[PDB]
Amino acid sequence: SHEQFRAALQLVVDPGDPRSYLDNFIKIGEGSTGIVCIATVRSSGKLVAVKKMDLRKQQRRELLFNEVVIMRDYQHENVVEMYNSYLVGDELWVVMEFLEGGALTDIVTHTRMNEEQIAAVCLAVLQALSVLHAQGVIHRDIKSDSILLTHDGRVKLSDFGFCAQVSKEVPRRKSLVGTPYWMAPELISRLPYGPEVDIWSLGIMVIEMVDGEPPYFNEPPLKAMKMIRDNLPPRLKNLHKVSPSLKGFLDRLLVRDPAQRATAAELLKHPFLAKAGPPASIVPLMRQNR
Structural domains of the chain in order of their starting residue, each with its CATH number: 1-98 (3.30.200.20), 99-290 (1.10.510.10)
DSSP state of 143: S
Neighbours of 14 (CB within 10 A): 13
Distance of CA 235 to CAs 15, 62, 160, 264, Å? 50, 36, 28, 21
Q: What gap in Å lies between CA 219 and CA 241, rounded to an integer?
A: 24
* CA 54 from centroid of its chain's CA atoms: 21
Resolution in Å equals 2.3
Q: What gap in Å lies between CA 76 and CA 135, rounded to an integer?
A: 12
Active-site positions?
A: 141
Alpha-carbon torsion, ordered 41, 27, 281, 126, to 10 deg: 90
Q: What gap in Å lies between CA 289 and CA 29, rounded to an integer?
A: 21
Residue 36 known to bind ligand: yes
| Residue 144 amino acid letter | S
Q: What gap in Å lies between CA 24 and CA 50, rounded to an integer?
A: 11
Q: Transcribe 29-86 into DSSP letters.
A: EE-SS-EEEEEEETTT--EEEEEEEEGGG-SS-HHHHHHHHHTSS---TTB--EEEEE
Q: Which residues of 220-243 are buried (b: 16+ CB within 10 A; e: fewer)?
A: eeeebbeebbeeeebebeeeeebe
Give the DSSP H or E segment for 13. none
Method by which the coordinates were obtained = X-ray
Give the DSSP H or E segment for 264. helix 264-267
Distance of CA 143 to CAs 18, 159, 201, Å? 30, 10, 7
Name the nearest CA neighbour of 72 among 178, 6, 160, 166: 160
Q: What gap in Å lies between CA 30 and CA 49, rounded to an integer?
A: 12
Residue 160 known to bind ligand: yes
Q: Is 133 exposed, middle or buried (0-12, 13-18, 19+ CB in 10 A)?
A: buried
Residue 99 known to bind ligand: yes
Name the nearest CA neighbour of 142 among 200, 89, 103, 59: 200
Q: What gap in Å lies between CA 272 and CA 270, rounded to an integer?
A: 6
Name the nearest CA neighbour of 81 among 63, 99, 93, 66: 99
Q: Are 179 and 141 in contact (CB under 8 A)?
A: yes
| One-letter-per-residue 3-state SS of 205-246 | HHHHHHHCCCCCCCCCHHHHHHHHHHCCCCCCCCHHHCCHHH
Q: Which residues of 27-44 are buried (b: 16+ CB within 10 A; e: fewer)?
A: eebeeebbbbbbbbeeee
Distance of CA 268 to CAs 24, 46, 50, Å? 41, 35, 32
Q: What gap in Å lies between CA 37 and CA 49, rounded to an integer?
A: 6
Q: Are 143 and 184 in contact (CB under 8 A)?
A: no
| Residue 5 amino acid letter | F
Alpha-carbon torsion, ordered 182, 172, 222, 209, to 10 deg: 0
Residue 29 known to bind ligand: yes
Residue 136 known to bind ligand: no
Q: What gap in Å lies between CA 248 and CA 140, rounded to an integer?
A: 24
Q: Are 251 and 203 in contact (CB under 8 A)?
A: no
Q: What gap in Å lies between CA 124 and CA 23, rounded to an integer?
A: 32
Give first-to-last CA distance, the chain, whole Å. Answer: 50
